[PDB]
Design a protein around this ligand. Structure first.
Ligand code: I31
Length: 86
């Protein structure tokens, strides 16, 4: 299996709210649940659906931004990385 990561508490709370029922993940799983979270809460822009609006949301605190594009993979990996236990 791919490497296992441990989300810090704030990220863990987000992943669980999206439906995760464990505390240890592969990066693929973290990405999956983040997508599910964004979709369920409809944080994406209705007309430009690759844009995520995350002000007034834990995701914004986690990523340190008010908006981002799902196309920004390197940035998203970095934002996730600062929310994993080293
Ligand atoms: C929630 C919407 O997600 C996506 C939407 C679209 C459309 C433009 C077709 C709308 C396209 C792709 C996506 C889309 N890209 C993915 C695959 C992605 C996988 C890896 C990285 Cl590093 C980044 C993104 C994923 C799972 C995602 C979105 C957001 C986050 Cl924070 C995490 C995962 N969703």
């Amino acid at each position: 299996m791919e490497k296992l990561v441990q989300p810090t508490p704030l990220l863990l709370s987000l992943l669980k709210s999206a439906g995760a029922q464990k505390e240890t993940f592969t990066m693929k799983e973290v990405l999956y649940h983040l997508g599910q979270y964004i979709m369920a809460k409809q944080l994406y822009d209705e007309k430009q659906q690759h844009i995520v609006h995350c002000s007034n949301d834990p995701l914004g605190e986690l990523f340190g931004v008010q908006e981002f594009s799902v196309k920004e993979h390197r940035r998203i990996y970095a934002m996730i990385s600062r929310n994993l236990v080293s």
